[PDB]
Design a protein around this ligand. Structure first.
Ligand SMILES: CN(C)[C@H]1CCN([S@@](=O)(F)=Nc2cc(Cl)c(C(=O)N3CCO[C@@H](c4ccccc4)C3)c(Cl)c2)C1
Ligand SMILES: CN(C)[C@H]1CCN([S@@](=O)(F)=Nc2cc(Cl)c(C(=O)N3CCO[C@@H](c4ccccc4)C3)c(Cl)c2)C1
Ligand SMILES: CN(C)[C@H]1CCN([S@@](=O)(F)=Nc2cc(Cl)c(C(=O)N3CCO[C@@H](c4ccccc4)C3)c(Cl)c2)C1
Ligand SMILES: *[C@@H]1O[C@H](CO)[C@@H](O[C@@H]2O[C@H](CO)[C@@H](O)[C@H](O)[C@H]2NC(C)=O)[C@H](O)[C@H]1NC(C)=O
Ligand SMILES: *[C@@H]1O[C@H](CO)[C@@H](O[C@@H]2O[C@H](CO)[C@@H](O)[C@H](O)[C@H]2NC(C)=O)[C@H](O)[C@H]1NC(C)=O
Ligand SMILES: *[C@@H]1O[C@H](CO)[C@@H](O[C@@H]2O[C@H](CO)[C@@H](O)[C@H](O)[C@H]2NC(C)=O)[C@H](O)[C@H]1NC(C)=O
Ligand SMILES: *[C@@H]1O[C@H](CO)[C@@H](O)[C@H](O)[C@H]1NC(C)=O
Ligand SMILES: *[C@@H]1O[C@H](CO)[C@@H](O)[C@H](O)[C@H]1NC(C)=O
Ligand SMILES: *[C@@H]1O[C@H](CO)[C@@H](O)[C@H](O)[C@H]1NC(C)=O
Ligand SMILES: *[C@@H]1O[C@H](CO)[C@@H](O)[C@H](O)[C@H]1NC(C)=O
Ligand SMILES: *[C@@H]1O[C@H](CO)[C@@H](O)[C@H](O)[C@H]1NC(C)=O
Ligand SMILES: *[C@@H]1O[C@H](CO)[C@@H](O)[C@H](O)[C@H]1NC(C)=O
Ligand SMILES: *[C@@H]1O[C@H](CO)[C@@H](O)[C@H](O)[C@H]1NC(C)=O
Ligand SMILES: *[C@@H]1O[C@H](CO)[C@@H](O)[C@H](O)[C@H]1NC(C)=O
Ligand SMILES: *[C@@H]1O[C@H](CO)[C@@H](O)[C@H](O)[C@H]1NC(C)=O
Lengths: 171, 325, 325, 171, 325, 171
C-alpha cells in the first residue's frame, strides 16, 4: 500500500483478532492473546461511516421520472428528449463508478496509514527497551507482564521503570 | 527463552467480497457496502397507500373516449400513477386523428382523480336530432356500438336543425371535454346523415375558439371505414362556459371528466400485475424497497427512488485488504 | 539543567472557521476561503453601463400592442435586459389569442433596441375607412380607447372598400409588424362594421403568406366582450415589402418597431426597483458583485455571474487544523 | 491525520508562531522564541494558491441564463425544459460540494505531510547529537547558541563540529 | 577507503513532457500519455466501408424536389452519412414554404438508402391535363425548366377536369411522396391555368388527411415570381394507398423515393472533399483515426468517435518527476 | 513530494538507470553500476496501466452526434437544443480536465511513496551493519561483494553473517 504497512512490512492479517481492525498480540509468561486497539479502531469506524453517509447524502432522491410521447411529426423533439435522458444517464453512471473507485483507493490507504501510525506510536513509547524483530513485532529487553502489556496497549508505558533492566539485557 | 514480545497487526476474516480501485481491480477486502440496488418484487404495488389506475385493455385514448370493448371504471377514481398494458388492443376505433393527443397525455400525468359525469344528457340535450348512430368499427359483443362518452348526432325526420348547446362548469375543478368531427367519404353520405353540404361545427370557451368544417374525399378503408373522425379536447376552467354550435358532423360530448391535480404521478407501461402491497418506489418491472442511492433496475421510476445507473456493480470498501494467510 | 532544545510545530490562532471533509465534518481550521456568494444589493442596476427596459404595469403583449393604461415609452430605447413586474395588470385588453406569443418573447430576448415609428399614418393610409373605433375593454382614464399601435378599421358611409396598403422596409433593420383580426359574435355586427359577410384579410411578405377569415359565433363574455381579437406578428427583413389586403375585420397596424439585435440580454420578472448603480451581474432579487465561482442567490442571471448551486455552504480549507490548546 | 504529525505525535499548535504555518521553537542560554520555516511555508502557500485558483478557473463564467414561456398546449416542452434545468443544477451542485469535500481532505493531509517532512529533515541533520524527547522536540547533547540554532533552522547543521562534545554528554 | 556503499534512487531521462496537477503546474516528468486527439486527415472518407451521399450544389430540399441545376444522382443510392456543401446555391427555386421541412431532415437522418421511381408516369397518369408547364425560376442551361420529381398540371383545351389518381405502395418499404400547391398572384392567372376559382387539392392516406385551397393575393416578387408554391410531403407505409384529388393548383408528384432505415447516420455540412479512404470516425473537418477517449477537433461526429471537449491539452503522467540534474 | 523521497532527501534522479523507475547503485571493490528493482518497478507499471485504462474505459464511445435545424418560428426549441449541447459540453470538459489534474497529483505521490518504501525496506534489512550517509545511501561497515550486493537488491540479506564484522568496524 501507500504507507507500506498493510501487505508491506506486516505481511498478513490476524484471523484471531475479531474485536477490531487494528490491535496487538502479546506473548509473556502469563500467556498470549489478541487485543484490538479500541481508540484507533473506533476512530476509523466513525470516519468511514461519515464517508459512506457522505456519498449516500450527495445523491438526491430520484423523484418521479417517466417517458413522454411524440407524434410522427415531432421526431426532432423526441430525439432531443432522448439526447437529454441519455446524456444525464451517461454523466451519473460516470460519476457513480468513478467516485467509488477513487474513494476505494483512499479507504485502503487510510487503513494503511492507521496501521503505520499505531506501529510508530508503540515504537516511540518503547524506545530501546525493546527491539524491532521485524514483521511489526517488538522483543522486550525486560520482563513485561499483563499489567505492563496493558500499559503498552494504552499510552502509558513507563520507560524509566524498565530502562535499567533493559540496558542490562541489551548489554 | 527469546523473551516477551508485543506485535502490531490488522484484522482478517473469511470474507470473499471484492472491490475495484483505480490502481488495481478485484481486491478482496474484509468489509464492504453494496450501494447498487438490483432487487425488486416484480409486482405492481400501491404508492404511498394509493392504488394506481389500471386501464386494462385500453390506452389513454380508448379510456377517455370510452371504447365499448373495455370494462367501464367506477364514475370516480383516485390514483398515484397510470398503468397501460403493453398490448393495448383498444384505442381509437373509428379511424381518424386525435389532435394534440400527446399533450393531453402529459396533462393527465399531473392528474390525481377524475369524476365522470353527464355533461349533456342523452335524452335531454338533443331534441330534433337522432342520437342512436352506431358503427361496426367500434363493436361490442359482436354488435355495432359507439363511444360511451360521445354521441353521433344525425338527421331526424329529414332535417338537421342548427344545434346550440352550452355547459357551465360548476364542479369547482377543471373539466375535460372531448368531441369528434365526422368526415364522410362522399357528399351523398353527407346529405343522408346531416342534410347540409356547407356544414360546420363551432366550439368556444373563454380561452378556446375553433371552427371545424367537413372535408369530403374518398379515402383508403381503415377498420373497414373510408370515413374519418377527428377527435378534439379542451380543459374548461372552473366557472367557465363551453358552447357547442353545429349544423352537422358534430360527434357531441355526452360524458365529461372533472379532474383533480396532483404531484409525483405519471404514465408507465407494465406487463406486471396488481398485488396487495405498498411501496415508496415503483418501476415498470416492479417495486423497490431500498435506501441505497443507486439502482440498475429501470430508468422509469415513480415515487422516491434510487438514481438509475448503467453500472453492473457499485461496491464501496469499508474494511481492509483481507490477508488471512 | 536539562539542556538546549529545538522543537518542530505548526501554527494555530483564534479562528473559528469550520469546513467539512469526506472523513469528518465540522473541522475548525486556521485559514479558509469561502467560494459561495450569497450577498446581493437588492436593487435593479445598469448592466455594463446600459440601463434595462422597465415595462412598468405592462407585460410584453401590453407594451407591443400599446395598451393605453401603460405610460408610453420614448420612441427610441436601448437596454441590456427587460424587466416585467410580477403584477402585470395590463396585457391583452380585448380578449383573443396572441398567436406565437411565446416565440415573439424569445425573439425580443436578443433585441437590444427599438424605434417606434408610424408604418401606416392614421390620417393618410386609410381613406374611405373609419378609424375611430374604440372599446370599453381597453379603457383609459375612464373612457373607451384602443391600442396605441393598431387601428380599428370600420365601414365609412355604408361601405367598406377593399383596402390595399403596403410598406417597404427602408430602415436598414428588421421591422416588427403587429396586426389583429376581429371576430364579431353575430353576423348582424359583422355587417354593421364591415358591410361584408365573406370578408377576408391577406398579409404577405417575401417569406410570410397567410390569409384570415372571420369566424362568427356566440361566445362567453370576457372583459364584457363576446367578440374576439386574434393578434399576429411577423418580422419584415430589411428591404422587404409587406402588403395588407382586406375587405373587413382587419385591425390594421399603425405603429411598428425597428429592432436591433444584441447579446447577453433576456427577460426577467422582478419586484425590485431601479437604482443609480452599475453591475456586471444581475438577478431578479438583486445585483451581484463577486469574483467567486458559485452563488446560491438565484438561478436567473444576466451578464457575467457565478454558477448557481443549491448548496448552503462551500468553504475550502487553506490552512491547518486549528489546535490552539 | 494521515501522516501522524498534526494531532498526532505533535499534539497541539503554537499560537505564538504568527509568521508561518510551520516553524521552530528554540530554548538555549540566550533566550527562547518562535521562528517559522520560510522555505516550507512559502512552498505550501504557492501550492494551495494554485490549488484554489485551479478550482475557480475550472468553473466557467455563468453567462446570461433566463426562463422561457410556453402556452397551455406546450406542457411537454415546458417539462423538458424544466428537466434540463433541474438536471444541470443537480450535477453542478453535486460537483461543487464533492470537489470541496475531497479537496479539503487533501489539504489537511498535505499540511500533515509537510510537518512530518520538516520534522524528519531536522532529525536526519542532528543524528545522535540530540535526543528525541517526544512531542516533536530534540534535546541537544551539546551547547547550541543562536548561530547554532539558525544552522538547524536552515539546512547547514555541522554534525562533525559538535559530535565530539555530544558523544561525551551522551556517554 | 570510505567503504562499500549501496544507494536507492529513481529514474531520470531527457524527456521534456510537462503535465499539470492541482498543487502545481508545468511539471516536467519522465513519462506521460496524451489523451486528447487533435489530428485529422482533412478529408471526407467512407464510414465502415460505406461512402456518404454528397449532394454537391443541392441542399436537401433541392435534391428531394429535383432541382434541375443539380447533377442527377443514380436511381438507387446507399450511404452512411449525408454531406451538404456550405454553399448550397440550389434549394427551393420556385418561392414558397416547405411545410415541416426540418422534420423531413430528421427523418432522412435515419435513412440508409433510397430508390427513385416513377410513382405517376408522365405520359400515362394525366390525360386531359397539360403537363409541360415550366418557369424561369427553375432554370437549366439558360432555359426555363421545372422540378425533376414534380409535374405542373394545367388546363388542356380550355378545361381542367377533376383528376383522381392513386398509388398503392407495393415496394415493401416506406415511400416518400412530395407534391406542391401553386398560389397564383391574381384570379386572372387562376382561370388561365386551372379554369376554376373554387379549386382544391385533396391528399389522403390511411394516416394522412389534408385539404389545400389556393390563396390569391398580390405578393412581392421573389426570384421574379409573385406566385408561391407550397411544398408538402408524407411517408406512405408499406401496403398503404395514397389518393390525389384536385380540380386545379396541384403540383403533382411524378417521382417518389422508397427509403430504407439505418443507424448511426446524420447530415453534416463540410467544405472537405471525398477521398479513397476508410474511417471509423468522421467530422466535418476530417476523419479521426484514434483510440484516445477525448478530441478537440469538432463536436459534430459520425461513427465511433472520442468525446469532444474544449480542452487544449489533456496529458496524464505515468512516470516520475524528471530530475536529471 | 508528499512522502518526502522524490525531490526530498533523495535530491535527484539517475540518468544512468535505464531499466526501471526505481533501483540501486552499488560501489564495491569489484566495480559499480546501476540496477533497477524489477519487483517494485513492475508493480508500479501494472497499477498505472490499470489506472490509465480505467480512465479510458470510463469514457464511453461517442456515437453519432449531429446538429439539427429549426425554422424561424422555433427559436425557443433551437435555444433549448443549444442549451443542452453546451451544458453537456461544459460538464464533460470540466470532468476530463479535473480528473487528469487530480489523478496526476496521485501518480506523483504514488511514485514518491514507492521510493520511500524501497528505501525503508533496505534500511530494515541492513539494520546497524551499515550507516545512513544521507541522500538515500548506506555505507557498509563490512566488505560487501557482488553476491552480497545482490542479496540486498532482493530480500535475502543475512544480517547475522556480517554482524560480527560490522560491529568491529563500527567499534
Ligand atoms: C447500506 N446503507 C443503508 C448504509 C447507510 C450507512 N452505512 S454504513 O456506514 F453503516 N455501512 C458500514 C460501515 C462500516 Cl464502518 C462497516 C464496517 O466495516 N464495519 C462496522 C462494524 O465494525 C467493523 C469491524 C471491524 C473489525 C471486526 C469486526 C467488525 C465492520 C460496514 Cl460492514 C458497513 C450503510
Ligand atoms: C476569493 N477568491 C477571489 C480567491 C482568488 C484566489 N484566492 S487565494 O488563493 F489567494 N486564497 C487564499 C489562499 C491562502 Cl494560501 C490563504 C492562507 O491560508 N493564507 C495566506 C497568507 O499566509 C497564510 C498564513 C500562514 C501563517 C500565518 C499567517 C498567515 C494564510 C488564504 Cl487566507 C486565502 C482567493
Ligand atoms: C494511448 N492509449 C491507447 C493508452 C492505452 C493504454 N495506455 S498505457 O497504459 F499502456 N500507457 C502507458 C503506460 C505506462 Cl506505465 C507508460 C510508462 O510510463 N512506461 C511503460 C514502460 O516502462 C516505463 C519505463 C520505466 C523506466 C525506464 C523505462 C521505461 C515507461 C507509458 Cl509511456 C504509457 C496507452
Ligand atoms: C493503561 O494501562 C495501565 C496498565 O494496566 C493502567 O494502569 C493500571 O490500572 C489498574 C486498574 O485496574 C491499577 O490497578 C494499576 O495499579 C495500574 N498500574 C499502573 C502502573 O498505573 C492504566 O490505568 C491504563 N490507563 C487508562 C486505561 O487510561
Ligand atoms: C544558515 O544559518 C547559519 C547560522 O547563522 C549561517 O551561517 C552564519 O552566517 C552568518 C551571517 O550573518 C555568519 O556571520 C556566520 O559566520 C555563519 N556561520 C557559519 C558557521 O557558517 C548560514 O549563512 C545560513 N545559510 C543560509 C542563510 O543559506
Ligand atoms: C537473492 O540474491 C542472492 C545473492 O546472489 C542469491 O543467492 C545466491 O544465488 C546464487 C545463484 O546464482 C548462488 O550460487 C549463491 O550460492 C547464492 N548465495 C546465497 C548466500 O544464497 C539468491 O538466490 C537470490 N534470491 C532470489 C533470486 O530469490
Ligand atoms: C464465514 O464464516 C461464517 C461462520 O461464522 C459463515 O457463516 C460464512 O458463510 C462464511 N463466509 C464465507 C464467505 O466463507
Ligand atoms: C478475483 O479474486 C478472487 C480471489 O483470488 C478469484 O477467485 C477470482 O477469480 C478473481 N476474479 C478475476 C480474476 O476476475
Ligand atoms: C423493506 O425493507 C425494510 C428494511 O429491512 C424491512 O424492514 C421491510 O420489511 C421491507 N418491506 C418489504 C420487503 O415489503
Ligand atoms: C481573533 O483576534 C482578533 C484580534 O487581533 C480579533 O480582531 C478577532 O475578532 C478574533 N476572531 C475570533 C474569531 O475570535
Ligand atoms: C462545530 O465545532 C464547534 C467548535 O467545537 C462547535 O462550537 C459547534 O457546535 C460544532 N457544530 C456542530 C457540532 O454542529
Ligand atoms: C465590488 O467589489 C470590489 C472588490 O472589493 C470593490 O472594490 C467595489 O467597490 C465593489 N463595488 C460595489 C460594492 O458596488
Ligand atoms: C532524447 O534522446 C534521444 C536519444 O536516444 C533522442 O532521440 C530524443 O530526441 C531526445 N529527446 C529530447 C526531448 O531531447
Ligand atoms: C515549463 O517548464 C519548462 C522547463 O523548465 C520551461 O522551459 C517552460 O518555459 C515552462 N513553461 C512555463 C513557465 O509556462
Ligand atoms: C490508424 O492507426 C493505426 C494505429 O497505429 C495504424 O496502424 C493505421 O495505419 C492507421 N490508419 C490510417 C492512418 O489510415
Amino acid at each position: 500500500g501507500l504507507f507500506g504497512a498493510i501487505a508491506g512490512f506486516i505481511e498478513g492479517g490476524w484471523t484471531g483478532m475479531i474485536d477490531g481492525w487494528y490491535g496487538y498480540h502479546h506473548q509473556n509468561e502469563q500467556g498470549s492473546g489478541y487485543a484490538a486497539d479500541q481508540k484507533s479502531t473506533q476512530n476509523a469506524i466513525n470516519g468511514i461511516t461519515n464517508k459512506v453517509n457522505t456519498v449516500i447524502e450527495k445523491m438526491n432522491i430520484q423523484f418521479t421520472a417517466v417517458g413522454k410521447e411524440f407524434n410522427k411529426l415531432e421526431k426532432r423533439m423526441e430525439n432531443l428528449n432522448k439526447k437529454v435522458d441519455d446524456g444525464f444517464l451517461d454523466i451519473w453512471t460516470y460519476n457513480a463508478e468513478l467516485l467509488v473507485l477513487l474513494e476505494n483507493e483512499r479507504t485502503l490507504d487510510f487503513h494503511d496509514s492507521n496501521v503505520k501510525n499505531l506501529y510508530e506510536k508503540v515504537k516511540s513509547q518503547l524506545k530501546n527497551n525493546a527491539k524491532e524483530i521485524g514483521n511489526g513485532c517488538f522483543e522486550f529487553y525486560h520482563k513485561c507482564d499483563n499489567e505492563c502489556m496493558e500499559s503498552v496497549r494504552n499510552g502509558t508505558y513507563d520507560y524509566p521503570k524498565y530502562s535499567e533492566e533493559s540496558k542490562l539485557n541489551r548489554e | 527463552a527469546p523473551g516477551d514480545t508485543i506485535c502490531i497487526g490488522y484484522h482478517a476474516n473469511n470474507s470473499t467480497d471484492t472491490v475495484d480501485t483505480v490502481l488495481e481491480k478485484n481486491v478482496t477486502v474484509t468489509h464492504s457496502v453494496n450501494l447498487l440496488e438490483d432487487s425488486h418484487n416484480g409486482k405492481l404495488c400501491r404508492l404511498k397507500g394509493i392504488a394506481p389506475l389500471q386501464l386494462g385493455k385500453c390506452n389513454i385514448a380508448g379510456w377517455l373516449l370510452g371504447n365499448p370493448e373495455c370494462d367501464p371504471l367506477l364514475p370516480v377514481r383516485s390514483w398515484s400513477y397510470i398503468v397501460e398494458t403493453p398490448n393495448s388492443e383498444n384505442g381509437i376505433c373509428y379511424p381518424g386523428d386525435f389532435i394534440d393527443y400527446e399533450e393531453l397525455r402529459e396533462q393527465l400525468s399531473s392528474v390525481s382523480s377524475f369524476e365522470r359525469f353527464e355533461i349533456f344528457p342523452k335524452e335531454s340535450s338533443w331534441p330534433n336530432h337522432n342520437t342512436n348512430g352506431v358503427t361496426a368499427a367500434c363493436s361490442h359483443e359482436g354488435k355495432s356500438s359507439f363511444y360511451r362518452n360521445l354521441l353521433w348526432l344525425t338527421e331526424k325526420e329529414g332535417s338537421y336543425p342548427k344545434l346550440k348547446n352550452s355547459y357551465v362548469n360548476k364542479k369547482g375543478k377543471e373539466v375535460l371535454v372531448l368531441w369528434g368531427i365526422h368526415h364522410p367519404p362522399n357528399s351523398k353520405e353527407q346529405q343522408n346523415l346531416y342534410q347540409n353540404e356547407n356544414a360546420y361545427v363551432s366550439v368556444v370557451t373563454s380561452n378556446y375558439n375553433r371552427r371545424f368544417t367537413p372535408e369530403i374525399a374518398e379515402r383508403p378503408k381503415v377498420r373497414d371505414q373510408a370515413g374519418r373522425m377527428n377527435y378534439y379536447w379542451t380543459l374548461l376552467k372552473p366557472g367557465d362556459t363551453i358552447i357547442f354550435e353545429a349544423n352537422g358532423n358534430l360527434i357531441a360530448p355526452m360524458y365529461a371528466f372533472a379532474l383533480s391535480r396532483g404531484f409525483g404521478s405519471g404514465i408507465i407501461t407494465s406487463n406486471a400485475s396488481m398485488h396487495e402491497c405498498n411501496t415508496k418506489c415503483q418501476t415498470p418491472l416492479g417495486a423497490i424497497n431500498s435506501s441505497l442511492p443507486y439502482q440498475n433496475i429501470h430508468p422509469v421510476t415513480i415515487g422516491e427512488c434510487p438514481k438509475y445507473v448503467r453500472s453492473a456493480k457499485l461496491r464501496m470498501v469499508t474494511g481492509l485488504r483481507n490477508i488471512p494467510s
